[PDB]
Amino acid sequence: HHHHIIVVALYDYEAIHHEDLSFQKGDQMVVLEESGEWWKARSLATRKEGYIPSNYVARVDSLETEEWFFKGISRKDAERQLLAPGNMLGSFMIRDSETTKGSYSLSVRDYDPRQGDTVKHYKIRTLDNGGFYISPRSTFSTLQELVDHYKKGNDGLCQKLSVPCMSSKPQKPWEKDAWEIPRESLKLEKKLGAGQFGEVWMATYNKHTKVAVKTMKPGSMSVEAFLAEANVMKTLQHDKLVKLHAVVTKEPIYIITEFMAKGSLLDFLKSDEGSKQPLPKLIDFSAQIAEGMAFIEQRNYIHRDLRAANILVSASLVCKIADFGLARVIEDNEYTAREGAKFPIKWTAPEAINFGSFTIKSDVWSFGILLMEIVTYGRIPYPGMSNPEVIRALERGYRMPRPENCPEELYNIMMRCWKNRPEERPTFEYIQSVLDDFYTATESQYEEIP
Ligand SMILES: CN1CCN([C@H]2CC[C@@H](n3cc(-c4ccc(Oc5ccccc5)cc4)c4c(N)ncnc43)CC2)CC1
């Protein structure tokens, strides 16, 4: 009923809107209301009221207040964060277990010549009368005691704990209730590119926030159809999908999203920087997209144009799916027809080309082609073949051969994605599983330390 949760700032926040409350790390507050990413709160110190970023604060009695506790992180994202540049041997984090509810997991950066950079996971068990342990000989009253113990010595661990995994201030939340925004709120600063049905620009919103704006050409979309689809796209909240912040519901329609500093995955892989990414990183890029596409599958949605051109890359090298569902709202009329085909033949499933049958299974086919794009660093699919040759070849059972530097398991995934019958193709859930655990035939999941 009432709101009795007291929170403390995990970072400083300077108000940029109207009803937002500014605060500094340590400042404690009372949550008066939970309105999503924004929470109405009261300063325990200066009595001031106002909205605060929910991701910048934590319950005062929580482990979320600790530098080494990572709340709401998956085993995979912990591995990716720990293996990120700027972390050292023994870098570590404690997180909520994904296998045993109420219990915790210790993730540590390790290095072996034969294995390379690795992340080892330890199960922190809870004691019934209070306390925690990884090995029965070593029990602790608190998790801080456990950390300090393993920071003094490995005591069975792969490495002595060094420093907490590095973290950065999270993204500031988009303004409360600013979905359909005025066009004058946006200053278009640099055109990033121009396509068949519109352009993309880097811009500033209300002088305070950098964003990307997809500007759709007049005649490309109905305002009402677009807004209905956009209201669904807004619900597709997942870390591997580009964040849609707002829209201008007047022709020319604008779609405002977070800015992704490294552009398209296609351009990145063809870049001097991306060409140097090792195969394990390429498989991780693939798994990131598979996680996003598994979410879209669980939500009964369809991308309709999956390809490296439609994957965006952050400065932190995180891949995020873009243009999910957009092809459904690009109308087929006299205006768009001049721009040429909406779908790239070499990425499109045969049933979609021949009958317009677009489903999650046609996305699976496209994901297979995207996997080949990634392992080939952006090479055109079906090298040496025109679009007409590809369609007739696919009808005769032709499939792209395994490229160099392509693990056979990855190629096998591609082949399954390219089954002619959509029902015989794998689920994104399966694809995500195989890719997330590609190098984990180690089994055990955790470490069995005595
Ligand atoms: C040769 N190159 C030249 C550069 N081209 C680039 C043109 C714009 C780039 N680009 C595009 C985007 C982008 C922006 C909005 C968008 O709209 C939707 C998002 C989700 C669901 C539905 C619609 C989709 C994509 C982008 C970005 N956010 N942040 C940073 N860069 C971004 C992506 C590639 C690509 C080809």
Residue numbers in the entry: 80 to 114, 116 to 255, 257 to 531
Quoted passage from the original study:
Here, we report a new X-ray crystal structure of Hck bound to A-419259 in which the activation loop and αC-helix are fully resolved. The kinase crystallized in the closed conformation with the SH3 domain interacting with the SH2-kinase linker and the SH2 domain bound to the C-terminal tail phosphotyrosine. The SH2 domain engages the tail phosphotyrosine with the positively charged side chain of Arg175 in the phosphotyrosine binding pocket of the SH2 domain forming a salt bridge with the pTyr527 phosphate group in the C-terminal tail. While both inhibitors occupy nearly identical positions within the active site, A-419259 has a much more extended structure than PP1, with a cyclohexylmethylpiperazine group that contacts Asp348 and a methylphenoxybenzene moiety that extends further into the hydrophobic pocket. A-419259 induces an extended activation loop conformation with the tyrosine autophosphorylation site facing away from the active site and into the solvent. In the kinase domain, the complete αC-helix and activation loop are clearly visible with the autophosphorylation site (Tyr416) extending outward from a short α-helix. We propose that this preferred A-419259 conformation represents a unique intermediate between active and inactive conformations of Hck and possibly other Src-family kinases, while PP1 induces a more fully downregulated kinase domain structure.
Hematopoietic cell kinase (Hck) is a member of the Src kinase family and is a promising drug target in myeloid leukemias. All family members share regulatory SH3 and SH2 domains, a catalytic kinase domain, and a negative regulatory tail. In this state, the SH3 domain binds to a polyproline type II (PPII) helix formed by the SH2-kinase linker, while the SH2 domain engages the tyrosine-phosphorylated negative regulatory tail. Extending from the active site is another dynamic element known as the activation loop, which bears a single autophosphorylation site (Tyr416) conserved across all of the family members.
